Design a protein around this ligand. Structure first.
Ligand SMILES: Nc1ncnc2c1ncn2[C@@H]1O[C@H](COP(=O)(O)O)[C@@H](O)[C@H]1OP(=O)(O)O
Length: 214
């Protein structure tokens, strides 16, 4: 009788969202104007001057930003029911957390921010079994992220997949030397239109763990 949320996750406060939102926009402009990116557009899009990444990532989160833990679809998603049953979930419901943003990334499909979860937060991370083939050798929670924008033709949960793809390269020493220096950190060109800004100082955001029902 009692149905679950659309998904659980950490929803940022109004200011943490505004700060992170603004930060993401600066990156999409700094990256768009960087000559290292403009000479690589052939790997990003298949058409043609300069591209404005902000407009490119037109499908943005309208309200407050968030970090999804477990997509439930009101209980239809596999493992949704077992996740909500967890004591840590019910105990943590409505409680405040601080999330650490380590990097900002961009791909032909998505623009997001990498979240590094603490051990207590990892307790709220789902350990469902029907895994991806992208999480091999990566620690659980690596997928943790905040979506800042999607291209027009992109599916949801793509931002999470893109991140894992990026981190798989970093693990394989395939990230390469930095191709630039932005005021917030070092810029990286990972090829295939993938980019990463490793923040000098990790950005902390306040958030509330809860459920979205839409
Ligand atoms: N099958 C899914 N698995 C995991 N996360 C999902 C899934 N479907 C949607 N989401 C995520 O839950 C939220 C639902 O948003 P939407 O309104 O588009 O359905 C999004 O943050 C999305 O992740 P993401 O932010 O990477 O797109």
């Amino acid at each position: 009788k009692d149905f679950l949320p659309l998904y659980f996750g950490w929803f940022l406060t109004k200011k943490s969202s505004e700060t992170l939102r603004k930060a993401g926009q600066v990156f999409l402009e700094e990256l768009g104007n960087h000559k290292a990116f403009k000479k690589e557009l052939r790997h990003f899009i298949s058409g043609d001057e300069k591209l404005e990444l902000v407009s490119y990532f037109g499908k943005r989160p309208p309200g407050v930003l968030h970090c999804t833990t477990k997509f439930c679809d009101y209980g239809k998603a596999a493992g949704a029911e077992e996740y909500a049953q967890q004591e840590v979930v019910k105990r943590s419901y409505g409680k405040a957390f601080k999330l650490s943003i380590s990097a900002l990334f961009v791909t032909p499909k998505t623009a997001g921010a990498q979240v590094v979860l603490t051990d207590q937060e990892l307790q709220l991370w789902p350990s469902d079994l029907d895994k991806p083939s992208a999480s091999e050798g990566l620690p659980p929670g690596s997928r943790a992220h905040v979506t800042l924008g999607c291209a027009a033709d992109v599916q949801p949960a793509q931002t999470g997949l893109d991140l894992l793809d990026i981190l798989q390269q970093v693990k394989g020493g395939s990230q390469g030397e930095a191709v630039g220096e932005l005021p917030r950190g070092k810029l990286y060109s990972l090829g295939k239109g993938r980019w990463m800004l490793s923040l000098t100082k990790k950005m902390e955001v306040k958030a509330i763990f809860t459920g979205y029902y839409g």
